[model samples]
Structures are given as C-alpha cells and as structure tokens.
Target chain A: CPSICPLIYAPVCVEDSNQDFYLFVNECEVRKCGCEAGFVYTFVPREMCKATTSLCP
Target chain B: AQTVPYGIPLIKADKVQAQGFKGANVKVAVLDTGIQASHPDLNVVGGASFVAGEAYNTDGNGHGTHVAGTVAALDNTTGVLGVAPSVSLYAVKVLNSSGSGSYSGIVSGIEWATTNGMDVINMSLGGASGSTAMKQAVDNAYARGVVVVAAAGNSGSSGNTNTIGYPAKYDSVIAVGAVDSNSNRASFSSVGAELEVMAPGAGVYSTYPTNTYATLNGTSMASPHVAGAAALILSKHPNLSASQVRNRLSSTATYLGSSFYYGKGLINVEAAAQ
Candidate 1:
C-alpha cells in the first residue's frame, strides 16, 4: 500500500486481532489503519462489518 | 473595449470594484495547468512550475488560463475583465498539458506559495483521496496568512454524501462549489460537510491559451472566483490574516441551500469587502 490513498469510498469489512469488526472506507484504508493501530485486520463480509462502527474519516 | 464577465457581477465583484477595491497589488498564485503568460488580458507577474519539463507561464491545457482570468485578468479596456482586475497573478503549473497531475506536484506548488509571500492561492484541482502530507502543506499555508481556495470537486453525481476531495476537503482550506447564473447548484458540484461556499462555475467565461477566451464549466471554475474575492478582501484590508479573510468571505455569503450543498452560500464580494 502507498502512503496516500484515493478518496474513493468502497466499503470493506475487516476484523481486528480482538475479533472486533470495523468498517473501513476501502482495503487500502484497512491496510493503512491496521499497520498504524498495531492490529492484524482480516477481510470479512460487508454484512459482518455493517453492525460495527466505521473507521473512515 | 472591455467587458465584465457575467460571473463578476453574479458574485457582486463589480460592486466591490465600484467601491474602489480592485485588489491592488495582491498576489494570487493559480495552482493548476499553468497560465497563458502572453495573454494580453493577463499579467502573470511571476511563478514556478512543479510540472515536469513545463514552464509555469505556458498554459497548453487552457484550464489554468480560464481560472486565472476569473481571478485577475488585467483591467485593460479589452477582452473580458476578472473579479479582481488589479490583483497580480502567478502561474504555478502543477497540472501538466493533459490536465493530469499528482498530489506530490500540487503539494510542491503549495509549499512554493506558502514561502513566496502569496496573499492568496487558487487551486482548481483535487483527488478523491486525502493525504496527511498534503493537509499539512495546506495547513502551513493557511497558518502563514495565505488564503488557500480549492475546488470542492466535480463529483456531485456521487449522490449528496461527503464527496469533497482532498486539499479542499481539509479544514485549513476553503472548499468552493459551483452554481449557475441563477444561483442553482451545478449538477456536478461535489457536496459535503466540508463545502465552504459556492461561486459561479457553470458556463464561466474567461481567458484561454493563445490569447483566446472561452466558456467552461466545473467546480474548477468556482474556486478561482472565491480566490479572487479573497484577493479583494485582502487588498481592501491588508491587516486581515488568512483566517480573517476566510471569515469575511464566508460570513458575507448569501445562503442558497443546505449546509451540505452551499457551506456559506454564494459569495458576495461587495459584502465581504464592506
């Protein structure tokens, strides 16, 4: 992943090491956020992340 | 011999000019696809280019010329006049001839304007993604009393959500949207919580490359109108800082729609100057 990501919003579901779901704007955001947050985010389904809080700004 | 562009009066810059505030000596840097240096109706005082292998004054894309004309085309009695007819324009060619550019090139232009004593900066470009590096650059310019204005982007077709692009999307910059002569939002004018104001961007008539003139449309055309108004405010009240200039413009704008559509509504240059 690059240091910068596009503003395009493509919802993605990701699970952290804590097994918590967070909706990211896209895969790039999850990748950026996971590395910075010290978590391993695994891709899930949109339905799985829909119930959790979104991590997008 | 000269005529005022329709946008000038639409935003009430004509009235502001009539009050003897024609943006005298204010330096506005147009960060875009360069400008037509030889355009008789324009006087590009100075500039630097971040676009690889291109001159700041050579506007092969014609977009920067149109944007520059809206900011400060000369007041000479020929062709069309700009809102701040007496303001000085600087061509910072960030976007190249194809009107394509990267955020890094734009950030370089931003840094140049920040360090070069630019009173105002007009960026008619943007991308969907936001960058922390770019935000910092825009913040530095704003903190240093450089009024930064950029297009809110032309993604209004994205359906009324937060569609504002970076740089303009940042709080440190003034994000401008577009409206027609009748004050209706342009269909393509991106909307968002960050949208700060609206200006005449639909079918805007201004200068073009090769000493020609043209009519173009986009939120791209809207940002420069506000940028020119920023110049008018700074020219009339040099003591005001960048934040104060933004406040004057936003506070004086007439509300035309919801906050998401028009942040401060359409800008009235006369009101801001007064």
Candidate 2:
C-alpha cells in the first residue's frame, strides 16, 4: 500500500459503500482518507459523481 | 561516506565535482512535503512549511527528503552523494503527510522561495489541472530570478500525447521528465512541449527520513537533478538569469532521441559547468 501520492490531480469521483457521492482529486486522496476511515470507494467519472453527487456542497 | 550514486555519474556531476564545481553559495528550495532537517547526508539550510499540522523539518511522508537529497546530499562519506554536493538546500514544505497540498499552499511556497531569494526551486509535485494563480506565482518567481523546476507528471502515454502537469506546464518553469540509467525514458515520464529536460529518476537512491536512505522513482525524483544542475550553474555565474541557466542546460544536454520524450535530453552538468 503506497502511502505517499504525488500532488497531481487526475480528477476522479467516487461513491462510498453507502452510495454517497464525493469528488476527489484522484483515487489517492480517497485512499489516504480511507487509510484511517476504512472507507471503500469505486472510481467514477465526474458526471457520474455529480448526476447524484455532493453531500459535499 | 561511500561512492557517488549512479545518477550522479550518469549526469556527469561527479566529473564536475572533481573539477571543483560543487554548487557553493547556490540556494535550492525544494517545494515538496518537507525534509528531515537533521539528516546527516543533507544540509537543509532553512525553510518554512505551509502544511497546517506539520513543521518544515518533519518529513513524515519522506518524499521531500528524497527530493532534497537528490539536489544536495553532502559528500561527507557516510551516505549517497547528490548532483550538486554543496548547494544550499531549503525545505519549503507545502504538501502534508499523505503527500498532497492545496494549490494555495503551493503558491505560498513559491512566493516564499521567491521573496527569500532562492536560486532554484524543485517542485516534485503537480496536477493535471492548471490555475491562474499558480501560473502567476511561477511567472512572478521567474521574473524575480528564481530558476523553477518541476516534475512533468507521471500520467504519460507510450504513444506520447500531451500529459504535462502544472505548474510545470507554465512557461517560466522547467518541466523535467524521467529516465533510467540506460538513458531510456521512463514509461511514466509525461511528454509535452512544456517538458524541458530529462534526468535519472528510476530507482534513484538518496537520503530518506530518520537517517535512512531509499530508492525512489518518479518525474519527481528527476526534477531535483535539474534543480541541482541549475545550482551548479548559478554558483559559477551568479549573474546568469533564470532563462540563461535554462539555455545553458538545454544547449549542453546529452541528446537522446526525440525532443518529445527527452526535451533537451538528459542534462549534463559536467558540460554546463564548462
């Protein structure tokens, strides 16, 4: 498990196990946050994340 | 304490060192996560961290430490040597423990390096997206005479479509790509018109946190090699502008293959020094 991710924003969106949508710079952000939270997400495009996204607003 | 690292010889910095061009009086600010300031192999002169919970010297992520060591790990005979052995290293910590930082934080680090008169800035981090503020910060730094170098990003294609990331994509900055010891461009080294140079990045051994050392890879690793090269140039001709330093390395570079992949090709500090 690589802990340090480069600062490049490949720009991905993800939905948690509960199907809540969130936008992230990339999967690394989700992984780093999930490192402590034990959260799992599926990488989705920005539109898919936004078609039903944002508890983030 | 041992031998010079393989990358040093590949870029001919070792030959330059024998000729007494060790980047003395040149200051290179590494704008990364942070650095282990107490590392015996590194001489981190000074820096400030913009990360909220971290100090400039606490490199929990180890990325910044690795980058800094590649720029100027001392030649004291205990650890791996760097490209510019005597260049002054500064830890401008912008990224956090997970190796990520905000755009604002990076801009702040750039501003700090420029205002404090950093001779060079090594940015081993970048994003696919570009920002107006980021472009301005790099331009301001360049206009103020800072030689800015950055990773060309890892999201490259085998067929060579433009994948260069900012702030490396900006005009004032030098976008550095990665190559292996064989001078083969790394599969992940981004290609674009913005890419300015190539350097040894695959399995590069350098200083790590807690008095340790490691072999790391990325365009990130390659970025510092050029920054150190710039330091060597500035140390000799302190009057050279940022553009002049860029041109020196460009003209002296070891031409590999297509400019699409190598940019100006692997930098030759040993040649640049002459």
Compose the digit string of candidate 2's lDDT tens values, residues B1-274: 4757789989888887887888999989999889999888888889998989799987998889989899999898578888888987889998887786778898899999999989999898876676788889999999998899999887665454687878889999999999998999987678888888999888888999899998887888899999999998888788899999989988999999888878989999978878
What digit string (tens of lDDT, one per residue) describes model 1 on residues B1-274?
Answer: 8978779999999888988999997999999889999999999999999977899989877888989999998888689999898898899988777666677888899999999999999888776676777989999999898999998876664554687877888999999999999999987677789999999988888998788898887787889999999999888999998999999999999999798988889999889888
lDDT of 2 by residue, A1-57 (tens): 223346333456887888877865445557766764577778776886642212122
* DockQ of the two-chain complex in candidate 2: 0.14
> Largest TM-score belongs to which candidate?
2
Query: For model 2 chain B, where is the 10-residue window of minimal lDDT?
Result: B154-163
Q: Candidate 2 — which residues are off by over 4 angstroms?
A: A1-57, B158-160
Q: Please estimate how well model 1 matches the true structure, expressed as its whole-model Cα lDDT.
A: 0.83
* Deviation of model 1 at B159, angstroms: 4.5
